[PDB]
C-alpha cells in the first residue's frame, strides 16, 4: 500500500457533513447555520436532531485547551438515570447529530445562540465532538476532531473556530464510488469581550483541495 497525489479531475458538486456534537446550552437557545461562497445563510433545521442533555465530556475523549491524571472536572462525567440505556445550569446540554449536504465549496458551519437574545448565563460554548466527518465513513477513517472536546468554566463565552482542510480521497480497495475524505484542521479561540464575529459560538470552517491522495 501507497499512496499518491493526483488531480482531483471528478471534483463532486456536493458533500455530506457528518456530525455529533455535545454542547454546554439547551438545544431551544441554539440555531444552526451553514453558509457558503454561492449562498447567504441558510438555517440548518431539518437536517439535524436537537436533543435535550445533561452535558458531559466522554471518557476516550481529548481534552483540547489544556493550556486553557484526570483533565475532566469529576462534576461532568456522565449522569445516569434508569431508562439511559432537571439539573444545575453547570450541566444545560444538547445532543445535536445529523448528516448535513453542502456544496463542496469554501463554506462553514455555524453553532451560535438565537439572536432580544439569549440571557449570557445560559450560553455556555464548552463542547464534546464526538464526530465530525465529510462523505461516506469508511474503515480507515481518522478524523482530527473525533472525539475531542473544549471547555473553560472561567470562559463560558469563548467563540471556537476550526479551519478544516479537506482532501478526496480514493481507496483502491473501497472504490471510486465511496465518498471519502480526510482532513487537516488548525483552531483558533476568542475571548467574548474581544467577539463582543458579532455573536459567539462554534464554527466550523471548510474547504477542499484541488488535489486527491490515491490509495493503491
Not at 16 to 34: A, E, G
Amino acid at each position: 500500500i501507497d499512496q499518491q497525489y493526483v488531480v482531483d479531475s471528478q471534483v463532486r458538486d456536493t458533500v455530506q457533513i457528518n456530525m455529533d456534537i455535545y454542547v454546554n446550552t439547551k438545544c431551544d437557545w441554539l440555531q444552526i447555520n451553514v453558509r457558503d461562497q454561492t449562498m447567504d445563510r441558510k438555517l440548518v433545521l431539518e437536517e439535524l436532531q436537537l436533543e435535550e442533555m445533561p452535558f458531559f465530556i466522554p471518557y476516550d475523549t481529548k481534552v483540547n485547551d489544556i493550556n486553557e491524571g484526570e483533565a475532566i472536572p469529576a462534576e461532568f462525567r456522565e449522569k445516569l438515570d434508569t431508562r439511559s440505556f432537571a439539573h444545575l445550569p453547570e450541566f444545560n446540554g444538547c445532543h445535536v447529530f445529523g448528516s448535513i449536504p453542502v456544496n463542496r465549496v469554501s463554506g462553514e458551519l455555524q453553532i451560535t445562540a438565537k439572536s432580544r437574545k439569549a440571557p449570557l448565563e445560559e450560553l455556555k460554548f464548552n463542547h464534546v465532538i464526538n464526530e465530525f466527518s465529510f462523505g461516506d465513513f469508511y474503515p480507515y477513517i481518522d478524523n482530527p476532531l473525533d472525539n475531542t472536546a473544549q471547555f473553560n468554566q472561567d470562559e463560558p463565552l469563548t467563540t471556537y473556530v476550526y479551519y478544516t482542510s479537506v482532501v478526496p480521497t480514493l481507496f483502491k480497495k473501497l472504490g471510486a464510488e465511496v465518498d471519502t475524505n480526510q482532513y487537516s484542521v488548525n483552531d483558533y479561540r476568542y475571548l467574548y469581550k474581544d467577539v463582543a464575529d458579532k455573536m459567539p459560538g462554534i464554527f466550523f470552517k471548510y474547504n477542499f483541495e484541488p488535489l486527491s491522495i490515491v490509495v493503491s
